[PDB]
């Protein structure tokens with residue numbers, strides 16, 4: 154019951170097995186008042202959620218969500234996304250796909266806004282996302298379309314404004330269920346929890362947190378990486394200087410509205426050089442490294458990832474892929 | 485100031501700045517707060533661990549919006565007798581006994597949506613839903629009055645609703661006893677939550693009230709006879725933590741089970757009728773506590789002598805039949 158679960162949380166106790174799932178299921182079946190949703194969200198956040206608990210929450214969401222048709226998602230598909238740099242992750246995603254690694258993203262409007270500004274059709278049913286993945290090499294699951302039952306939880310989150318445990322679930326509830334990815338987490342304390350959740354489902358993932366606060370591999374300083382592979386977690390410090398990347402300023406990597414990001418995307422994929430390109434290349438490589446961690450060395454993998462990412466841009470393959478992505482939505 | 489700012493601060497486990505709790509409660513009471521914001525605020529403040537300043541701001545806002553009793557109609561030395569709950573039988577009986585001893589009593593409560601304070605009184609034939617003028621007259625003519633919460637705190641209705649929806653106790657559970665609209669300066673105030681009792685006492689202290697905030701070490705929001713009780717003695721803006729043992733005053737230990745509105749009424753009639761037992765003892769104990777608190781208003785009398793006088797007065801109020809008569813007169817007053 155709610156008094157039971159909420160009571161347990163306000164007493165600063167971890168939940169028993171299944172309780173978080175029950176709570177989430179009530180929320181997802183419209184059997185939860187806004188006050189109950191809000192109380193749970195806040196309490197779960199201030200207690201400090203466990204990997205088990207967050208896993209149960211994402212599990213329920215995925216159990217209710219629209220799936221992609223059987224055998225439409227390649228076994229080695231990847232995600233590139235952050236909890237919240239949507240400009241960097243959107244560009245990295247295009248680059249990774251152009252390098253030949255299938256990419257299936259999942260998001261909402263406020264990084265879907267940027268893709269729409271670029272002329273991409275973001276709101277597609279499972280059948281067409283599958284077609285997009287196969288034919289273009291990339292797909293996007295529009296969260297409101299795939300998680301309609303979450304709308305009540307979505308409204309509460311906007312009403313209270315502040316971040317909660319629910320801010321962690323985006324990368325964990327991709328309806329296409331990619332087994333790999335580059336996952337940004339702005340909250341250092343929670344990044345290890347997310348990595349724990351990915352470890353549980355045996356994903357090959359790099360959970361990343363810039364030491365400057367970015368939910369992305371940064372170039373202004375070092376980054377912390379929770380490398381998830383073989384169901385286990387390794388925590389590393391990462392410095393892109395080891396790969397010849399010059400230090401940049403934080404203000405140089407920041408995003409703007411959909412139109413500004415769209416302009417930045419066209420610039421980078423058009424061959425523009427500077428710190429924005431560098432960050433994109435770096436994060437694209439990270440996703441490729443995660444992809445490699447599925448079927449099997451750290452530095453050689455990175456060096457190869459950086460080559461493939463840079464080439465995907467310089468050959469124009471990334472720019473072409475975007476053009477083909479746009480053209481797909483019209484055909 | 486905003487909900488994101490305030491809720492963000494609380495979730496970061498920081499105390500609020502001066503005025504923020506007040507701003508939040510004001511929003512809640514002027515209908516400018518979403519149920520989700522209300523619930524988030526109540527839960528977040530609870531898990532952060534509320535301060536006396538913060539709870540004081542909440543109660544302060546509520547009282548600033550409340551309907552007052554008319555000028556010069558509440559005696560200087562009026563007292564409250566109540567618990568946070570979450571012992572209505574005991575506090576109701578204790579209140580009648582205290583009033584019959586000659587200490588003006590003004591209570592504050594609401595009907596229960598499951599049982600509560602007003603329900604016991606209704607079952608006894610008391611008219612609970614009176615306006616300020618009639619509560620004032622009740623207090624003057626009968627020696628006791630009851631402020632029906634919905635009537636005096638109308639703007640609080642949205643907050644009260646959210647309380648029930650989330651179920652679990654929050655800091656909001658402290659506000660009832662802290663927002664008696666007659667603003668009595670003394671009382672016996674029970675708190676079921678041992679952690680928040682000290683906070684309550686701090687709020688009363690800031691007001692320079694003379695109160696015993698009480699928590700039975702068996703969990704009762706009332707002075708118990710089953711074991712010891714923790715009392716936060718509030719007087720002269722100072723809080724003093726004490727442990728109270730009824731055995732020190734000759735009370736035999738009782739079991740918890742020995743302590744429904746129709747059933748509460750029967751228990752009230754029995755005790756006021758002279759029936760001996762653990763229930764009477766508990767009533768006499770808490771009545772005496774209210775009387776000790778009352779004494780702390782004007783005199784700096786010692787702990788022991790004050791209690792012994794309190795116990796004598798409570799017992800006499802029952803044994804002379806004064807308590808029984810006062811209830812009857814209370815019932816007749818409403819029917820007039």
Ligand SMILES: O=C(O)c1ccccc1Nc1ccc(OCCCP(=O)(O)O)cc1C(=O)O
Nearest residue numbers: 260261296297298300301303304307320322323
């Ligand atoms: O807004 C609505 O009432 C609604 C109506 C139809 C379909 C979806 C609707 N809202 C949503 C449903 C799911 C959802 O889940 C998206 C997950 C949020 P996150 O990006 O993972 O953090 C978000 C919304 C929304 O209103 O934004």
Ligand SMILES: O=C(O)c1ccccc1Nc1ccc(OCCCP(=O)(O)O)cc1C(=O)O
Nearest residue numbers: 594633634635637638640641644647659660663
């Ligand atoms: O229930 C509480 O937590 C509470 C605490 C302190 C004071 C009053 C409290 N309750 C209420 C206050 C106002 C109210 O308003 C009800 C509607 C009043 P009106 O019809 O507009 O005049 C209802 C309650 C309640 O307990 O349900």
